[PDB]
Structure formats: structure tokens, C-alpha cells
């Protein structure tokens, strides 16, 4: 299998503020990786795809990066509403596998 | 609208079995690899399993082989998932997802199905 890792399990941050949270591959995924947001009592929220493409009805403020092995997703503006664990998850070979998660404050 | 409609939370006694039914609608059921997931609470993202509904091949996450068994009907358009030898270990949140086969990605999901083995 490929692990997935977000090496941190929570990340603070402030309304208005900007905040990236990392993903690491175990091995070269290329640009197959994708995002999710999971609300509390919500199910996961696809949000990326393909390392850094949007998801149909995805805002402007959410953006990702990152290629082979390192991987970063990022919001520019923190909202209230962004109030979610995230979870990266690589979609490069079987079986597919998630990230840790990194719960944001 | 496309959705993903689980069956109810279930409360279960430990050993015993239960089939967690998920009925699809909005898209060609047949085009598109039906997922689950396990999360035991609070914890991270754990696929299971994906079913092909033209023709119910399924693959597994090697850890749910003999836990899970994935089958599909077409003509109602659900998935289905049958845990057996429960116990609280398995007493978790579990999650039918579709994907695409390319690109790859998890882009619809149930509202959720709580399983309690007690």
C-alpha cells in the first residue's frame, strides 16, 4: 500500500487567516491524490481531485497543490464554516488509501 | 439530483450479521464503482471495498476480506454490504461511495450508516 500522511493531526488557525495543511506520499503518486472535508455529523465533501483540480461547485478559496510524493492543500481564507477534519487520499494504485487527518481549529 | 440513500442505524449484538443497503439514483447506476468505508469514531478514512455493477466483481481492502461481503442489485439500483462475526470492534461509521473508474476520486457518499455491536 501507499501512506498516505498528514503529519499533523490538528492545525490552528484564525478566521481571514491563511492555512495549508500537508500531505506526504510513501511513494511518486504523480498528481493522483485527492482532498475531502468531512463536517461534523456531515459525510467526506470531495473538494479535490487530481492533486490540485476543483470539484464541481467548489468555492474560489480552497486551492491545492503538490506533485510525486509532497502534497499540500490550502484555504485562503478561513471561514467559520470551514470548520472540518481533512483528509488527502491518493488515487495512484490498489488499494486506494487516506491520510491521517489533520482536524483544524 | 443524484443521491446515495443508506439504511438505518442498527443496533446489533455481537456475532451476529447485518446487510447495510445503500439505493443510488440520479446517474446511470452501472457506470460507476460502488465504494465503502469504515470509520471507527473519530478516526481516519479506511476504504473496505468497491463492487462492479455490470457484472458484481468486487475487490477488497485485504483487511475486510472475510468481514465484508459487497453485492449489488441493478434492477433497484442498491449496493449492499453484509459484515459477519460482529463485535465492537467493527461498531463503527460506514460510508457507500461511488467513483469514477478515470479520474479516479470518491465524488458522492451516503449520509451514513452507524453500526453498534453490543
Known amino acids: 500500500?501507499?501512506?498516505?500522511?498528514?503529519?499533523?493531526?490538528?492545525?490552528?488557525?484564525?478566521?481571514?487567516?491563511?492555512?495549508?495543511?500537508?500531505?506526504?506520499?510513501?511513494?511518486?503518486?504523480?498528481?493522483?491524490?485527492?482532498?475531502?472535508?468531512?463536517?461534523?455529523?456531515?459525510?467526506?465533501?470531495?473538494?479535490?481531485?487530481?492533486?490540485?483540480?476543483?470539484?464541481?461547485?467548489?468555492?474560489?478559496?480552497?486551492?491545492?497543490?503538490?506533485?510525486?510524493?509532497?502534497?499540500?492543500?490550502?484555504?485562503?481564507?478561513?471561514?467559520?464554516?470551514?470548520?472540518?477534519?481533512?483528509?488527502?487520499?491518493?488515487?495512484?494504485?490498489?488499494?486506494?488509501?487516506?491520510?491521517?487527518?489533520?482536524?483544524?481549529? | 439530483?443524484?443521491?446515495?440513500?443508506?439504511?438505518?442505524?442498527?443496533?446489533?449484538?455481537?456475532?451476529?450479521?447485518?446487510?447495510?443497503?445503500?439505493?443510488?439514483?440520479?446517474?446511470?447506476?452501472?457506470?460507476?464503482?460502488?465504494?465503502?468505508?469504515?470509520?471507527?469514531?473519530?478516526?481516519?478514512?479506511?476504504?473496505?471495498?468497491?463492487?462492479?455493477?455490470?457484472?458484481?466483481?468486487?475487490?477488497?481492502?485485504?483487511?475486510?476480506?472475510?468481514?465484508?461481503?459487497?453485492?449489488?442489485?441493478?434492477?433497484?439500483?442498491?449496493?449492499?454490504?453484509?459484515?459477519?462475526?460482529?463485535?465492537?470492534?467493527?461498531?463503527?461509521?460506514?460510508?457507500?461511495?461511488?467513483?469514477?473508474?478515470?479520474?479516479?476520486?470518491?465524488?458522492?457518499?451516503?449520509?451514513?450508516?452507524?453500526?453498534?455491536?453490543?
Open positions: 463492487i462492479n455493477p455490470n457484472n458484481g466483481g468486487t
Open positions: 487520499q491518493q488515487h495512484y494504485s490498489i488499494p486506494r488509501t
Open positions: 487530481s492533486a490540485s
Open positions: 440520479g446517474y446511470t447506476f452501472t457506470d460507476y464503482y
